[PDB]
Design an enzyme around this catalytic site. Structure first.
Site, PDB file in Angstrom:
ATOM      1  N   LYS A 107     -14.546   8.409  -3.403  1.00 56.85           N
ATOM      2  CA  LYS A 107     -15.789   8.784  -2.744  1.00 56.85           C
ATOM      3  C   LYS A 107     -16.300  10.089  -3.302  1.00 56.85           C
ATOM      4  O   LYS A 107     -17.480  10.248  -3.551  1.00 56.85           O
ATOM      5  CB  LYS A 107     -15.638   8.870  -1.225  1.00 56.85           C
ATOM      6  CG  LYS A 107     -15.231   7.532  -0.593  1.00 56.85           C
ATOM      7  CD  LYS A 107     -14.603   7.713   0.786  1.00 56.85           C
ATOM      8  CE  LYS A 107     -13.692   6.551   1.192  1.00 56.85           C
ATOM      9  NZ  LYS A 107     -13.162   6.868   2.510  1.00 56.85           N
TER      10      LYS A 107
ATOM     11  N   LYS B 186       0.915  14.162   1.515  1.00 53.65           N
ATOM     12  CA  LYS B 186      -0.429  14.516   1.066  1.00 53.65           C
ATOM     13  C   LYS B 186      -0.594  16.030   0.800  1.00 53.65           C
ATOM     14  O   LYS B 186      -1.580  16.469   0.137  1.00 53.65           O
ATOM     15  CB  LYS B 186      -1.478  14.011   2.063  1.00 53.65           C
ATOM     16  CG  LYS B 186      -1.588  12.481   2.110  1.00 53.65           C
ATOM     17  CD  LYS B 186      -2.501  12.007   3.252  1.00 53.65           C
ATOM     18  CE  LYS B 186      -2.529  10.501   3.418  1.00 53.65           C
ATOM     19  NZ  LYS B 186      -3.440   9.858   2.440  1.00 53.65           N
TER      20      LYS B 186
ATOM     21  N   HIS C  31       0.776  -1.246   0.000  1.00 56.10           N
ATOM     22  CA  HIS C  31       0.000   0.000   0.000  1.00 56.10           C
ATOM     23  C   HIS C  31       0.812   1.303   0.000  1.00 56.10           C
ATOM     24  O   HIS C  31       0.217   2.398   0.151  1.00 56.10           O
ATOM     25  CB  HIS C  31      -0.826   0.056   1.276  1.00 56.10           C
ATOM     26  CG  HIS C  31      -1.801  -1.061   1.407  1.00 56.10           C
ATOM     27  ND1 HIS C  31      -3.096  -0.965   0.967  1.00 56.10           N
ATOM     28  CD2 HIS C  31      -1.681  -2.286   1.967  1.00 56.10           C
ATOM     29  CE1 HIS C  31      -3.727  -2.088   1.233  1.00 56.10           C
ATOM     30  NE2 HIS C  31      -2.887  -2.905   1.844  1.00 56.10           N
TER      31      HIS C  31
ATOM     32  N   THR D 135      -8.469   6.388  -1.759  1.00 59.46           N
ATOM     33  CA  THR D 135      -9.857   5.962  -1.896  1.00 59.46           C
ATOM     34  C   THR D 135     -10.856   7.116  -1.631  1.00 59.46           C
ATOM     35  O   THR D 135     -11.977   7.117  -2.133  1.00 59.46           O
ATOM     36  CB  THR D 135     -10.149   4.818  -0.954  1.00 59.46           C
ATOM     37  OG1 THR D 135      -9.693   5.161   0.365  1.00 59.46           O
ATOM     38  CG2 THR D 135      -9.469   3.623  -1.420  1.00 59.46           C
TER      39      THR D 135
ATOM     40  N   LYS E 215      -8.406  13.694   4.896  1.00 64.48           N
ATOM     41  CA  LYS E 215      -7.525  12.530   4.908  1.00 64.48           C
ATOM     42  C   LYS E 215      -6.520  12.704   6.055  1.00 64.48           C
ATOM     43  O   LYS E 215      -6.423  13.807   6.620  1.00 64.48           O
ATOM     44  CB  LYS E 215      -6.767  12.435   3.588  1.00 64.48           C
ATOM     45  CG  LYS E 215      -5.923  13.628   3.309  1.00 64.48           C
ATOM     46  CD  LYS E 215      -6.113  14.149   1.924  1.00 64.48           C
ATOM     47  CE  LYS E 215      -5.628  13.239   0.870  1.00 64.48           C
ATOM     48  NZ  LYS E 215      -6.728  12.972  -0.052  1.00 64.48           N
ATOM     49  N   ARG E 216      -5.761  11.661   6.375  1.00 60.10           N
ATOM     50  CA  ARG E 216      -4.733  11.796   7.412  1.00 60.10           C
ATOM     51  C   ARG E 216      -3.738  12.937   7.049  1.00 60.10           C
ATOM     52  O   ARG E 216      -3.449  13.201   5.844  1.00 60.10           O
ATOM     53  CB  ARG E 216      -3.988  10.456   7.693  1.00 60.10           C
ATOM     54  CG  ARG E 216      -4.834   9.377   8.365  1.00 60.10           C
ATOM     55  CD  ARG E 216      -5.394   9.756   9.723  1.00 60.10           C
ATOM     56  NE  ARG E 216      -4.309   9.862  10.680  1.00 60.10           N
ATOM     57  CZ  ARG E 216      -3.852   8.876  11.458  1.00 60.10           C
ATOM     58  NH1 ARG E 216      -4.414   7.682  11.489  1.00 60.10           N
ATOM     59  NH2 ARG E 216      -2.812   9.105  12.235  1.00 60.10           N
TER      60      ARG E 216
END
Ligand code: QUE
Ligand code: QUE
Lengths: 807, 807
Positions: free
Chosen positions: A651, A545, A348, A647, A539-540
């Site tokens: 969504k 990110k 992952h 993911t 998100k985290r």
């Protein structure tokens, strides 16, 4: 009320009502004069769970009767969220319960807000596990989820003075009506001890024992009467001065106390290693028992697949070998053949800090037999590498399960590849990156091992559940089949010039926005402008990110408004949300910068309601189901090459947001599915990041050439966003200027320009909404049903199915 | 089947059966192909508990409606035993469930053996609490039991190599179907901190918080539809690096982890003090809330009685004062008036080692506000002593709540007397001893404070339940009313020459003996001769209870047989059973001597089945219900003056054993009730013990004058009962010869002679059985209904009642 929610049958309603009252009286021991909404939630929850048990017993009984290959999805995390709505939807009882609770004078939706998330995950990898169990039940697979029942899931985040504070996620306080405890199927797990070689065999002796007690939760497929099981193990001290000895039972019970809160980061803590062995040992005994209860293991790979979600249960491989060789007396060679054919491994991330690399000393102490087995595995595996590539000794040192160094370690990824028949990444770009870089040597040895399995999300929770309005307007044109055949959404393309659909799509979004705005004002007294563009990054919190890149954009918007107050700009509410790992100082500083930017922006009277910045507190699966349907712009702005799939991206696409993103992870496939012209793609591609790495990344260059960027950095240094503590963000500044691994400044200009394109489109509602249609209509590939069907056919060797069981 | 067990109605049976199947399917999620007897037990347990809830809700609702004075029985121990049979018997469902389970092909009795004891007590004082809750519900009192829900009750005892081994009593492993968790009524308890005087008032600040979560268990009265509540508090960490902080929640949760296993012995451990405050603080908030929910406290003593079971919840007194003064702002004087009139105190021993005497430093640290309040209490109380006895300063130092010394301590008994309107002992001799000795000064100050309340046992558990055969033969002659009016047993005297009754009594005993012998052989492979006299001493192992004196008698019987092998003696199976406190070395050595005597006696071929000695392992409430109905001789041989009452004594009397005993505790009243001629009374009376104390007890004298005694001591010293370890018992010998506080040798001769009288009677079955009748027929006074009626009228100020509530 709405059609996709099902029938409120008159008998059904009448039956539910009395079962509600029965549980309230007999189960809860309450009458209607003292009952809280909490009691009402529980009465409803018990009532709804009774509707599964018939199917739950028959499904498991049916797998005893037909003996299909069983699939075991082994994960340290199951990020399940709430269960009540999901169970009603999958059983077709949502309108019936809504009407029945209405007739009792109760608001069902209000009742649902009482349920705690089962927050037994950190983020992407745990939710994927959750979506997969849903899709496997919906596809008729004899599939079990195996994990740990943490007493405490992912911490509840509070924000005090603009800073994250963590507190215990006491999710079991009022009980869990969904699980059934099975103390009668408790099993021993062993730690420490030492190894004796006798003959027959090696023997693992003088161990300490921890008991593993399983709790079974039902996993209902979509309207097909299948109910599979999620089994979670809980730690228990063995049967056998005095007070302190009773109190010391806690030490062993601490194994399942709390989820480790690191997203994509390896901490080498012994307790974490214990948790990994605990889940693996308990689970494999279950598997073996079940296989025997149908002692020749030729057929074991035809009857068992074990899927390893990351390296976290990688010990399954030397554990299966240990059982087969030491307890079942199989020759090593046969045992290994069985093991490789039983196991497969999903990666992952490519980020080195996530790699599990356990000190040899630690494994030697805690799991002596497993270390020996790992050494023997490594020897035979490297023997194979030598035969295939004679004389390539650097390849040998690189491929070894053992890393030499100050501390000798075992590389758990290398173990997984060696002990598995299939290895997969989670989006096409990611799977190719694995073959080009970190696993390239392993690819050259065994190319047919390596696969792609692009992630997905379940359209049950992530559409029908969270956005019933959108699901309804879609059902009105195409029927309900898309719910478990999401490729049917392509039929919506034929509506891209249908005036009624364009209207309905905009109306549904607007209703989600109004509702989300109401939530924020009710539960937090924060005012948001509902005619603003809802710009959301949830998100985290990590550097890769690039929440900081969003931060730079937000402040750019602010400085632009101040420089030209009278120039029209599209109003935005910029929302950022997510948890930082407790120990990750940088992540915590970033959350603080977001709230600090809010402190200036949201109190500037020249800006007013033209720009607001809010930090959404305590992002979790239930909050995702609220904010994602309300969103206009989906921020997916990771450095090219760093987000394996994502993911959350999927969504937002499913729920009527347009995406601004890099060509990273599954963003690449999403743009391919919809047409790139329907995505706001910006920034370096992977190739360009590499060229920058070859040359050396020098932030100073971007600072010297970009005045608007320079002004933001100077505002950060000088204390504009922290007047009382002027050097508060010097660590952020210094990282950005001199140690930025994720190259924030290099995508700044292209990002700001692309964000201008977003606003330009938003000014044309009609064309915004047509682009949205083109996104929704091409989201079908991103269903977890598709993903799981690919796992079943290409790795597990089973055929999925859409047929009902008896009523 | 038998009449006292009730009606197996056809509808009732049909209803129970389907409710059984319903719970098995919906509650347990099992079908009949996989179900264990354990599942069957649980299905039955849920089914039976549903029959209470109607009454449980109405009873509590009725106390809201009629506002009677509430009685709060506050105890650190509730030795409840099993609940399933008791609940069936009190609801009249025993035959109906037996028939229903029979029709399902199940043996109900076998199912009952699956239930764990709620062993939340040590011995007498905890069982009394349990019997009292039963009797209070049967007498229609609005009474609550308040205690702690220990995760681990009294340890399970194993015997390995003849020695006690303790293991955790994991009574909750498979759940508890009887309790209902009430996390919604959780309450904060405070520890540590420091005191601030402001105005208004003192303030207790900077405290640590522990949450107290109540669990409610139903307490059904006998056939009267009353269902009262036992509420037990469980400890929970407050809502608010990271991993260690989550793990450190255990420290606070350890407060309710484990019952302290000291019977009649004070250990000054902080954790124990915390447990005492925890139960007292949580309980008093409940009480006060309930009182407010009907802020002027004049009427509080008319609406609340708090009964203190020993000094263990003695903190109730300064806690009630703290709440009234600091939180409710009452003047001290009014607060004290309320407190004294609310509280009353029951003493259960005169032995100094049992006295709670907490270090002042410890109270200062853990409960600073309570220490100040205790000081103020003491000052005003001693002011009263000075006014009543001017110039008697030794009386002042003796009566003080504060003991001066190397360590300053608070005497908790003295606090109880000062803060209570009534103080009682638990049998007439004991209550008089209190007035003559340890509480004499307090008696002279406030004579009308001091009362007697002779203990009792419930004839539900202790006859109908455990000995249905005896209950049946009695019901056949006198009806069923005696079950809650045990003084009706006196009607059995008119049957002392009835041949059929004499026969039936002997036949029932013989059936109990056969059955108990079967238990031992099945569950432990130990062979007992069922035509032997069953001689039994079961109770906690202590020196004052004189298990060693029994030991001397047993060996005397052995040496007599060996000296004259051919002389007839009545065969006996001598049974001794009970737990030793883990730290009490002497107690543990005694258990070992009993098994060692068995090792010789039971393998001597000259003795054969004429004498066997067995140590009954793991004596607990459920084992009491088996062995007591099987017993012929009840050993009650404590040193005169040491056993405050005893209750095991009463059980044996009720169940058809004859008693050998000293004139101690309630033995004195039992002999008075039956006629002394119907008891084997031997040994020193209290007066004679005192004379011995005045002169000095010299063991050597008895050794020098008693050859048979000398031979036993020499066998002990020289290693006859421990050949491999000849000095094994030197500590027992030395204690007996030089430090015997309980004067074992002084009662030896009279005991052996009295035991000869027992055997002589046993040779005449007819006259044995007539004496038994005379005992059973006079056991009525020893019903806990009698005891509780006396508490209600003489201390609490409420009138008991026998009337039904609606069906
Ligand atoms: O915004 C939302 C909201 O406030 C509630 C809610 C919360 C507490 C209550 O008591 C209640 O009745 C409803 O549910 C929601 C459910 C969604 O799927 C989406 C939302 O945006 C909301
Ligand atoms: O001696 C006894 C005995 O063995 C059992 C028992 C134990 C296990 C079983 O599985 C079972 O069916 C019965 O119950 C009893 C109940 C009594 O009140 C008295 C006894 O003496 C026994």
């Amino acid at each position: 009320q709405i059609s996709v929610r099902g029938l409120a049958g008159v008998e059904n309603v009448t039956e539910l009502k009395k079962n509600f009252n029965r549980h309230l009286h007999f189960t809860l021991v309450k009458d209607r004069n003292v009952a809280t909404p909490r009691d009402y939630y529980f009465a409803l929850a018990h009532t709804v769970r009774d509707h599964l048990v018939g199917r739950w017993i028959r499904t498991q009984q049916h797998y005893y009767e037909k003996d299909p290959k069983r699939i075991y999805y082994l994960s340290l995390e199951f990020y399940m969220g709430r269960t009540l709505q999901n169970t009603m939807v999958n059983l077709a009882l949502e309108n019936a319960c809504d009407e029945a609770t209405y007739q009792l004078g109760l608001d069902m939706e209000e009742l649902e807000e009482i349920e705690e998330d089962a927050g037994l995950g950190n983020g992407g990898l745990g939710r994927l596990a959750a979506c997969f169990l849903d899709s496997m039940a919906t596809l008729g697979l004899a599939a079990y989820g195996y994990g740990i029942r943490y007493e405490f899931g992912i911490f509840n985040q509070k924000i005090c003075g603009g800073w994250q504070m963590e507190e215990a996620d006491d999710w079991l306080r009022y009980g869990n009506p969904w699980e059934k405890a099975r103390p009668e199927f408790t099993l021993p797990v062993h730690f420490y001890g030492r190894v004796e070689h006798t003959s027959q065999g090696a023997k693992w002796v003088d161990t300490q024992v921890v008991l593993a007690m399983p709790y079974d939760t039902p996993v209902p497929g979509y309207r097909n009467n299948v109910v599979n099981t999620m089994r979670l193990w809980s730690a228990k001290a063995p049967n056998d001065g005095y007070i302190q000895a009773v109190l010391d039972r806690n030490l062993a019970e601490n194994i399942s106390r709390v989820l480790y809160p690191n997203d994509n980061f390896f901490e080498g803590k012994e307790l974490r290693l214990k948790q990994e062995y605990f889940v693996v040992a308990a689970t494999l005994q279950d598997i073996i028992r079940r296989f025997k209860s149908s002692t020749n293991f030729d057929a074991f790979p035809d009857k068992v697949a074990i899927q390893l979600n990351d390296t976290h249960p990688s010990l399954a491989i030397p554990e299966l070998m240990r059982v087969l060789v030491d307890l079942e007396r199989l020759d090593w060679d046969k045992a290994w053949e069985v093991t490789v054919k039983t196991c497969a491994y999903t990666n992952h991330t490519v980020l080195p800090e996530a790699l599990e690399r356990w000190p040899v000393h630690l494994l030697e102490t805690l799991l002596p037999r497993h270390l020996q087995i790992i050494y023997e595995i490594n020897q035979r595996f490297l023997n194979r590498v030598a035969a295939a590539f004679p004389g390539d000794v650097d390849r040998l040192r690189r491929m070894s399960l053992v890393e030499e160094g100050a501390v000798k370690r075992i590389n758990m990824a290398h173990l997984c590849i060696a002990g598995s028949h299939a290895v997969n990444g989670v989006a096409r770009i990611h799977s190719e990156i694995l073959k080009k870089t970190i696993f390239k040597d392993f690819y050259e040895l065994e190319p047919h091992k390596f696969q792609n399995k692009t992630n997905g999300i379940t359209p049950r929770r992530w559409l029908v559940l969270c956005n019933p309005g959108l699901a309804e307007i879609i059902a009105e044109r195409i029927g309900e089949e898309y719910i478990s055949d999401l490729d049917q959404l392509r039929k919506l393309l034929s509506y891209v010039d249908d005036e009624a659909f364009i209207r309905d799509v905009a109306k549904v979004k607007q209703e989600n926005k109004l509702k989300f705005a109401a939530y924020l004002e009710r539960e937090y007294k924060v005012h948001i402008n509902p005619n603003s563009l809802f710009d959301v990054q949830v998100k985290r919190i990590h550097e890769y990110k690039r929440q900081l890149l969003n931060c730079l954009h937000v402040i750019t918007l602010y400085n632009r408004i101040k420089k030209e107050p009278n120039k029209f700009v599209v109003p935005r509410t910029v929302m950022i949300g997510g948890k930082a790992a407790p120990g990750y100082h940088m992540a915590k500083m970033i959350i603080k910068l977001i709230t600090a930017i809010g402190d200036v922006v949201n109190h500037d009277p020249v800006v007013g309601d033209r720009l607001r910045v809010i930090f959404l507190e305590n992002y979790r699966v239930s909050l995702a189901e609220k904010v994602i349907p309300a969103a206009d712009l989906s921020e997916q702005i990771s450095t090219a090459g760093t987000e394996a799939s994502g993911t959350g991206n999927m969504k937002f696409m499913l729920n009527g947001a347009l995406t601004i993103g890099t060509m990273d992870g599954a963003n690449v496939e999403m743009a391919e599915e919809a047409g790139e012209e329907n995505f706001f793609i910006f920034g370096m591609r992977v190739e360009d990041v590499d060229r920058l790495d070859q040359r050396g990344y020098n932030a100073q260059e971007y600072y010297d050439r970009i005045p608007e960027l320079r002004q933001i950095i100077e505002q950060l240094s000088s204390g504009f966003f922290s007047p009382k503590q002027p050097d508060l963000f010097k660590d952020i500044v210094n990282m950005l200027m001199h140690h930025d691994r994720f190259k924030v400044f290099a995508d700044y200009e292209e990002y700001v320009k692309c964000q201008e394109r977003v606003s330009a489109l938003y000014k044309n509602p009609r064309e915004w909404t047509r682009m949205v249609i083109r996104n929704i209509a091409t989201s079908g590939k991103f269903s977890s049903d598709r993903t799981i069907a690919q796992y079943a056919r290409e790795i597990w060797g089973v055929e999925p199915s859409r047929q009902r069981l008896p009523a």
